């Protein structure tokens, strides 16, 4: 019932701030579960060795201050709200081969009564691929994409892969290329600014091979 949905949103967002991290005590870390969905290779530039892919950047976390009691709102257990209204970890794609950070479209999130947020915004990413020179009767190249938070560090936000590989369940395949292999690995990265402070990334690669 929409009367109940309307009331819910107003009470969720009357005293909400999207600027502060949604933890009870500030020393806590926001846990964010991350997955990369590869949808389609849309452009392949064999001169400059660049491939453009359509991806989805799946993100999952709990916002403490967005819980409700379904009994109070006629049994509503989940709602769709605009991603612009909420705190987000500001997660970005990089080694983008023309322009630094890939622009990610702010689609609606699914918010559940437990505070659980699921968000799957679409994006277009230009990987710069390296040619594999191991054994090439048929050609191979290895394309990579880095994920990380733009501002927060590992102690404010922890990112965790939902799985070892990118999600290919919605991947439409090519007539020329095939994804031979793909993996996601997490990394702690140290920077010159900050000796005692960990940053975190997840790097997804895939090796594409030419069909005979």
């Amino acid at each position, epitope marked *: 019932k929409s009367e109940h949905e309307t009331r819910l949103e107003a*009470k969720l967002f009357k*005293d909400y701030s999207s600027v502060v991290r949604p933890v009870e005590d500030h020393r806590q870390v926001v846990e964010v579960t991350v997955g990369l969905q590869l949808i389609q290779l849309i452009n392949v530039d064999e001169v400059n060795q660049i491939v453009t892919t359509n991806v989805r950047l799946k993100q999952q976390w709990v916002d403490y201050n967005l*819980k409700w*009691n*379904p*009994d*109070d*709102y*006629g049994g509503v257990k989940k709602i769709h709200i605009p991603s612009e209204k909420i705190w987000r970890p500001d997660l970005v794609l990089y080694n983008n081969a023309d322009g630094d950070f890939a622009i990610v479209k702010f689609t609606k999130v699914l918010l559940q009564y437990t505070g659980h947020i699921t968000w799957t915004p679409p994006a277009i990413f230009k990987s710069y691929c390296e040619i594999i020179v191991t054994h090439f009767p048929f050609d191979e190249q290895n394309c990579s994409m880095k994920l990380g938070t733009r501002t927060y560090d590992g102690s404010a936000v922890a990112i965790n892969p939902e799985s070892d590989q990118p999600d290919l369940s919605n991947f439409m395949e090519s007539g020329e290329w095939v994804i031979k292999e793909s993996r996601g690995w997490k990394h702690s990265v140290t920077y010159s600014c900050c000796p005692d402070t960990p940053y975190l990334d997840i790097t997804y690669h895939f090796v594409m091979q030419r069909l005979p």
Partner: antibody
Amino acid sequence: EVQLQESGPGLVQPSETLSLTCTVSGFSLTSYSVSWLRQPSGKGPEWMGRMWDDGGTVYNSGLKSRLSISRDTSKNQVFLKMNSLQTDDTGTYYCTRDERIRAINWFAYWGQGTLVTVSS
Amino acid sequence: DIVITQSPSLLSASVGDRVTLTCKGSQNIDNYLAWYQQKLGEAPKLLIYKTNSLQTGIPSRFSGSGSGTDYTLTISSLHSEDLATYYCYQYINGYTFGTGTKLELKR
């Protein structure tokens, strides 16, 4: 200074309808929610519904078809109506003032209660 | 919804004794648990909300603790006017109440 007073008919027969009144002092109903609870005979409390600060209502889904909740802010009064009664409905009925954090609510202040007994 | 069981169901204790009541949930409650007192003929009185926040005008002897599925109310030294029935209740997933602990004083 925060007070709640429930008034009802002692006796109601089966098939008749119960109407209760909650009279409030020490605050306005426009800035606080008020819930009806009841505790039947040989049973634990249950929440029946709410008169929201903003004027609307929400009901316990199991009782929704039998109930209606209303208020007259000029009188500082909340009302409950309940029909198709049965001997199960015998118990004590409370109005509460509810307290809120973001979208979460809890019961903060009670009235003394009114005894309602359903019998031929 | 969440189901709640209270213990001890009936409790005996002399004045000045330290007593603890326990409230065990069937699922995770995540600290949205309140405790209220009910003497006979009188309006129920909230003592504690959100596991351990003391309601204003409540004496310091009353205190709360717990997490996940297991919560306690403590009365550090029992007074005679504390003779009442104590109920716990839960306010994140519907509204369910404990069966209630009756406190009888040793004498």
